Amino acid sequence: LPIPQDVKELVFDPNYYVPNGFVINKDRPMDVIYNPGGIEIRPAHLVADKPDWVRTASSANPYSILMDPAVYCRFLAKWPDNTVHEVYRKWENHMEMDYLKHELQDDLRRQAHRGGGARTATSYKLSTIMGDAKPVKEVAEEFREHDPVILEGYIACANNLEAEAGALNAVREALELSEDDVVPAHEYRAASSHPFDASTEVMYEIEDIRKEPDPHLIAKRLKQLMLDGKLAQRYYRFLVERLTSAVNEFLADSMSQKVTIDDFCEDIGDLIAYLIGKKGKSVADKFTASIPFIVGRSMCVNIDPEEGNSILDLSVRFQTGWRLEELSCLNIYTEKAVLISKLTEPKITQVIMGMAKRLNSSKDSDDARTHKMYIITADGSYLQVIRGALVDNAVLLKLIK
Amino acid sequence: PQDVKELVFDPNYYVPNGFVINKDRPMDVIYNPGGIEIRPAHLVADKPDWVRTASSANPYSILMDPAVYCRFLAKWPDNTVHEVYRKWENHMEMDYLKHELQDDLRRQAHRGGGARTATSYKLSTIMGDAKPVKEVAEEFREHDPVILEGYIACANNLEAEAGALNAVREALELSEDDVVPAHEYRAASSHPFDASTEVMYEIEDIRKEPDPHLIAKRLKQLMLDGKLAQRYYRFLVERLTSAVNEFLADSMSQKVTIDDFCEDIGDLIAYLIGKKGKSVADKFTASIPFIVGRSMCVNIDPEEGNSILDLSVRFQTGWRLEELSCLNIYTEKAVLISKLTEPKITQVIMGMAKRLNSSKDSDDARTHKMYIITADGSYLQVIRGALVDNAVLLKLIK
């Protein structure tokens, strides 16, 4: 009878409140649930493609929360004001929900993402043990399944599959594993090189521009390098489009802003002034503080006289034995990024914390400013570990599409 | 005026009440009876109400010579935006507009002037039909466009460009101070597969299958039987879905999108038959071999390992993007190449297409993308347009 005001107050019983004209499905009791005040609770997978059932990012919960699908079921609750909130109900607490679970395991569309029959997520045996990672040297020296490991050095990659193959070969060589042994979840570093035919002094100048804390100075100095003929327009435009793409990515995902810039070197000052004026001071200060991270990711310069100077795409990647639909519910497909809370499985928080600590151990923590962060599921999904601006110290996983 | 051809290019031809013509910038706004309003394209590039309206007569933008024609957008009372290209030599009063495009602070990254150089080397601005490198080298003035042999292993665009430049320099025995001609080459990138050779051959056979339903069924069945790992199946399905969506958005101008190829290709075919007619669906089905060949090109090498190839034929020109085309290349998804386009670009494209079709069973034409790379580094993919018969489009890669 009482009307719930928030998520926790909702009653999980199809027979608790039954309005006129609604017939409860006998074999599908959980398909729709009604609560007083007009609250509609439906399984998320049954309303994934409906435009009127998208999560509402608000001040309290601007981010969709990541929870374990094997333990929790994700419902969407729609209120009279059309605000859609996540609800997470434990599988063991409500037995009458079991069929929904079976749906997610046995639908034709989810066969590409879930186990069953002769399906194998990987061409090899990938361990499902998760937790903190350890250096691969001590793991090899100690040797049961291997614990998650860390590979030293770097892996040169042309694409994602090349990086994964190199990482798998590195783990197999470090642990002296066979083709049939169960390889563990692993942490590694990936580098992609884009050669630059520019003078070494120009490379040093762009490198020093990267370390500049003032974005206006960064843009002015890069454009001045372009205008003097020191940097070819091809390479300048390449760097500019990379900076623009990274800035737009940070604005869209990390800050949840609908604002985009066409090109960095002419519009970074305008964007910062806009963030001063329309979005308040604090949002602009956090954007400015994250500007070094964006510029380090986009404009990392490698200067080696042997094989030539280049621009680096640097990342740290944690390959887990869990599939995307075993690590996450279906919201990972419907949201730009998912927040990691206390209710989230502690092991993913542990792996992300270990990755962050290893990034911060570099000189001046510069690696944390120049490396992207990824968790690769067994079935090949990439989840970039990014920072969230709407919540302090918020860590997000963004599915790479 | 009832037509684009009937537009009067005179600011003083029709002056509405309350409007004052700027003496220093008279070409900014043009008024024509009925409410037709013509403005330069680069003054209205950021306005959401100044986007070209694709119709039956002109479904695509037109690639043009920026040094010969100036782009203007004409807005009609029914909110339809059309293109008008007006020659520089026919209007002196438009000259300042040209200077703007040459001297704007924003455009300094794309145009010449001062000490700006598009490339770190000297690249010839001679376009035309390309010739095999050996005869051109043995013949030796600036070189004519050149064709290289083999494939350049590339990890990214910059690596491919560097490899092509090195190949041209070595084959034409050019020094660092010599002018390098525009050159056509081939690029190949490999995504390794930890799949059995039999499964790879089955995937290759599925690629040649003309029925998309059979492609989906056979690939899904390979996944479900455990012969194809879910990781590689999802990789291939992601590539197929991306390619199908790209073909729909670019080649067919269709807003329809799919999420999984092997799950929704039949639904997409049924939707195209039901709502778009048999002709559109048949066009998509006939293009299916090209899409599947580009997405699932299978390389089987017992030494280097089996892989999925991204194959392309790229012609590096000496002209910058803003010296090859107007600013429409930034606004439109793709631009159509007509008889009004510079004949050199069409010559290059037909040469690349002919060299593609010279392969056995025209197989390369089904597995290769085509690119024109400008001097300052823009990539223009040559695609086919389903809205006009034999329509060639250049799509700026962003």
Side-chain angles (χ1 to χ4, degrees):
Chain A
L1 172 67
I3 298 175
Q5 298 227 343
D6 61 356
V7 152
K8 289 339 310 173
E9 279 161 20
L10 72 80
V11 184
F12 188 95
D13 192 357
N15 302 314
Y16 178 77
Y17 175 77
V18 185
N20 52 28
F22 158 75
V23 158
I24 165 62
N25 204 353
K26 293 179 179 179
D27 36 22
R28 294 182 61 106
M30 296 300 81
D31 81 283
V32 199
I33 310 168
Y34 282 47
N35 269 248
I39 305 169
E40 282 168 82
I41 320 164
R42 291 164 156 287
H45 57 270
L46 299 179
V47 289
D49 66 20
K50 300 192 181 178
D52 64 334
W53 278 81
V54 201
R55 206 189 58 74
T56 307
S58 34
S59 58
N61 33 53
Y63 294 166
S64 171
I65 282 83
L66 175 70
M67 326 261 288
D68 182 43
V71 173
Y72 274 93
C73 179
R74 169 153 197 273
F75 288 83
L76 294 168
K78 185 178 180 178
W79 301 69
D81 58 1
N82 304 330
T83 64
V84 177
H85 310 237
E86 316 162 273
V87 196
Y88 282 95
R89 295 267 146 277
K90 287 187 177 182
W91 286 122
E92 66 192 73
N93 187 284
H94 315 273
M95 180 171 174
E96 71 262 21
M97 272 189 338
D98 38 37
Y99 77 99
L100 292 170
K101 213 157 46 203
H102 290 291
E103 252 195 57
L104 312 165
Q105 195 73 21
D106 299 322
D107 200 9
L108 291 168
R109 182 152 316 253
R110 325 250 53 90
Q111 258 160 310
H113 319 290
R114 219 71 69 80
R119 284 166 274 161
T120 60
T122 58
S123 51
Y124 51 103
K125 298 178 188 175
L126 185 54
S127 165
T128 202
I129 294 322
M130 200 149 176
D132 78 323
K134 275 151 63 224
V136 81
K137 300 93 54 168
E138 67 187 28
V139 174
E141 283 176 5
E142 193 264 4
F143 281 83
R144 295 180 286 173
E145 288 195 4
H146 290 287
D147 294 332
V149 295
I150 311 163
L151 325 170
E152 183 178 2
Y154 253 99
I155 301 173
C157 65
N159 40 55
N160 279 340
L161 276 181
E162 269 257 327
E164 296 166 16
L168 173 61
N169 179 284
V171 182
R172 282 181 180 157
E173 273 184 5
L175 299 172
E176 256 307 325
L177 292 174
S178 75
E179 291 165 357
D180 46 275
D181 289 341
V182 183
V183 81
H186 40 266
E187 202 208 39
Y188 66 99
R189 294 271 192 65
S192 165
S193 287
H194 312 263
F196 260 43
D197 192 15
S199 83
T200 306
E201 165 282 4
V202 173
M203 292 285 103
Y204 284 137
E205 235 151 62
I206 316 140
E207 170 77 358
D208 168 293
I209 289 165
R210 200 187 58 71
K211 326 272 201 40
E212 173 85 272
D214 196 354
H216 310 100
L217 287 177
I218 291 173
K220 187 179 179 181
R221 288 177 65 187
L222 196 58
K223 185 177 176 179
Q224 196 56 47
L225 267 178
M226 188 279 270
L227 288 173
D228 296 353
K230 304 174 182 172
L231 191 61
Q233 311 222 235
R234 156 65 177 155
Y235 298 132
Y236 167 83
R237 284 207 319 158
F238 171 80
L239 287 178
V240 161
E241 56 95 353
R242 274 181 55 144
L243 293 162
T244 303
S245 77
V247 165
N248 284 337
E249 258 172 7
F250 189 90
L251 294 178
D253 320 332
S254 295
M255 296 214 346
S256 279
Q257 301 286 336
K258 329 292 153 212
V259 184
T260 188
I261 59 142
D262 296 327
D263 51 272
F264 173 86
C265 289
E266 317 283 349
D267 291 338
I268 190 64
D270 170 329
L271 170 70
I272 295 157
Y274 169 87
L275 289 179
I276 268 51
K278 299 296 183 181
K279 308 303 176 181
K281 183 178 179 180
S282 66
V283 175
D285 315 292
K286 36 183 80 166
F287 176 54
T288 294
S290 297
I291 271 293
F293 297 100
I294 299 165
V295 177
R297 284 162 199 148
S298 311
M299 189 162 81
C300 193
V301 178
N302 183 23
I303 302 170
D304 200 340
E306 290 86 280
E307 65 313 337
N309 313 145
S310 61
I311 298 292
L312 294 175
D313 278 342
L314 299 171
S315 55
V316 56
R317 282 143 189 228
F318 196 90
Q319 172 71 54
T320 72
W322 298 32
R323 300 174 210 199
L324 183 63
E325 318 276 51
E326 297 165 352
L327 253 204
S328 174
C329 301
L330 294 194
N331 56 0
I332 193 75
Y333 292 119
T334 53
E335 311 285 334
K336 295 198 253 93
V338 293
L339 170 72
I340 307 164
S341 313
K342 293 179 179 179
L343 300 171
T344 313
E345 208 244 349
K347 290 184 175 179
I348 79 95
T349 309
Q350 291 171 5
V351 311
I352 286 182
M353 264 192 312
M355 293 209 282
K357 292 209 321 301
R358 285 176 270 287
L359 278 186
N360 287 326
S361 74
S362 79
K363 293 179 179 179
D364 262 0
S365 300
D366 188 54
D367 279 20
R369 238 119 53 233
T370 59
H371 295 53
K372 285 187 178 184
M373 215 177 235
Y374 286 113
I375 325 182
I376 322 164
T377 65
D379 57 355
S381 300
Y382 275 73
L383 307 159
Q384 194 180 356
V385 187
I386 62 177
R387 62 180 295 275
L390 298 177
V391 169
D392 290 340
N393 277 298
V395 189
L396 312 181
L397 297 169
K398 166 222 181 42
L399 177 64
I400 298 293
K401 297 180 179 181
Chain B
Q2 293 218 342
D3 210 2
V4 179
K5 300 173 187 178
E6 296 180 7
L7 292 177
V8 182
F9 211 74
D10 193 357
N12 299 316
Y13 175 71
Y14 176 78
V15 186
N17 286 348
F19 178 73
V20 180
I21 300 169
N22 193 346
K23 281 188 178 180
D24 297 327
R25 300 178 67 115
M27 279 336 315
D28 276 2
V29 190
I30 310 163
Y31 283 105
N32 275 248
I36 308 168
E37 162 180 319
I38 312 168
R39 263 201 191 101
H42 61 71
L43 280 35
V44 299
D46 303 61
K47 301 187 183 177
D49 64 337
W50 280 91
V51 197
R52 212 192 42 93
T53 312
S55 82
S56 57
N58 44 23
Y60 300 110
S61 170
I62 299 266
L63 189 83
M64 278 300 195
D65 195 359
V68 176
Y69 324 92
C70 183
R71 192 169 190 260
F72 291 79
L73 270 40
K75 191 177 180 181
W76 296 68
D78 59 357
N79 195 340
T80 62
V81 177
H82 309 235
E83 293 174 348
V84 175
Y85 287 97
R86 337 287 292 172
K87 285 187 176 182
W88 291 121
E89 318 315 286
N90 295 348
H91 304 282
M92 304 330 85
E93 64 264 18
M94 284 172 10
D95 194 353
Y96 76 100
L97 288 187
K98 193 175 183 177
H99 289 296
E100 215 174 358
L101 282 163
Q102 187 55 284
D103 298 324
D104 202 6
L105 257 205
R106 273 175 165 307
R107 292 297 113 64
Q108 285 180 347
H110 327 295
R111 324 291 288 257
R116 285 164 277 169
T117 85
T119 48
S120 49
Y121 65 110
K122 251 148 31 172
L123 185 61
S124 161
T125 47
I126 298 177
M127 271 187 286
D129 90 327
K131 309 198 38 54
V133 65
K134 281 317 332 184
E135 58 223 47
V136 177
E138 183 178 2
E139 195 275 340
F140 276 82
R141 298 177 287 171
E142 292 191 3
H143 300 279
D144 294 330
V146 173
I147 310 159
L148 295 174
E149 50 60 18
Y151 284 82
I152 316 272
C154 65
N156 38 55
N157 287 341
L158 273 174
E159 171 135 302
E161 296 167 11
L165 174 38
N166 178 286
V168 179
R169 268 199 221 290
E170 189 261 11
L172 291 175
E173 57 219 40
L174 300 178
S175 75
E176 285 54 22
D177 294 325
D178 285 340
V179 180
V180 177
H183 44 231
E184 168 190 333
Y185 63 103
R186 289 187 172 190
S189 61
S190 288
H191 308 264
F193 257 47
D194 190 16
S196 83
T197 311
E198 319 85 284
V199 173
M200 283 326 251
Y201 271 125
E202 202 161 349
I203 294 167
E204 183 178 2
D205 195 29
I206 293 162
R207 181 186 66 84
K208 322 275 227 323
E209 198 75 11
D211 200 352
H213 307 113
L214 269 307
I215 299 162
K217 263 192 49 46
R218 289 173 66 185
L219 197 59
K220 171 104 177 159
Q221 196 60 44
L222 279 176
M223 176 259 285
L224 292 173
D225 292 347
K227 297 181 178 175
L228 188 62
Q230 310 221 42
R231 201 270 165 265
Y232 295 133
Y233 168 84
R234 281 166 110 246
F235 170 77
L236 286 177
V237 163
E238 167 257 318
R239 270 155 84 72
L240 289 161
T241 301
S242 308
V244 162
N245 288 327
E246 281 172 6
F247 194 87
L248 280 148
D250 307 349
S251 298
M252 324 208 48
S253 276
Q254 300 285 354
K255 293 179 179 179
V256 192
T257 178
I258 62 172
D259 289 345
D260 209 80
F261 173 81
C262 293
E263 307 283 353
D264 281 333
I265 189 62
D267 279 285
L268 175 68
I269 297 300
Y271 186 56
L272 291 178
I273 284 144
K275 293 279 184 179
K276 312 303 178 181
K278 183 178 179 180
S279 66
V280 173
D282 271 342
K283 283 183 185 177
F284 180 75
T285 305
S287 299
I288 274 293
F290 300 105
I291 296 166
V292 175
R294 289 191 289 251
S295 310
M296 323 171 24
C297 193
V298 175
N299 181 26
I300 298 177
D301 196 346
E303 308 83 286
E304 292 185 1
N306 311 326
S307 61
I308 296 289
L309 293 174
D310 273 295
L311 301 171
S312 53
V313 179
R314 301 176 179 179
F315 191 90
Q316 168 78 43
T317 64
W319 300 82
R320 295 172 208 195
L321 176 66
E322 305 216 10
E323 294 164 354
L324 265 168
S325 34
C326 305
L327 289 190
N328 58 352
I329 195 73
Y330 294 117
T331 278
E332 311 282 332
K333 193 35 135 192
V335 287
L336 168 72
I337 299 171
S338 85
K339 293 179 179 179
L340 294 171
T341 283
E342 175 70 18
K344 297 182 175 179
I345 307 169
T346 312
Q347 223 188 359
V348 163
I349 283 182
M350 317 282 228
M352 267 190 307
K354 148 157 41 76
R355 281 177 270 295
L356 276 186
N357 285 322
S358 73
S359 82
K360 293 179 179 179
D361 295 339
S362 292
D363 191 27
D364 287 353
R366 227 112 58 251
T367 56
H368 281 73
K369 287 182 179 181
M370 267 178 25
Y371 290 110
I372 298 176
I373 312 172
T374 66
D376 55 352
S378 297
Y379 274 71
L380 309 165
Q381 188 181 355
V382 189
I383 56 177
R384 100 187 198 76
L387 297 176
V388 189
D389 166 291
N390 287 331
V392 176
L393 315 169
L394 278 201
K395 167 196 171 185
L396 177 63
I397 298 292
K398 297 180 180 181

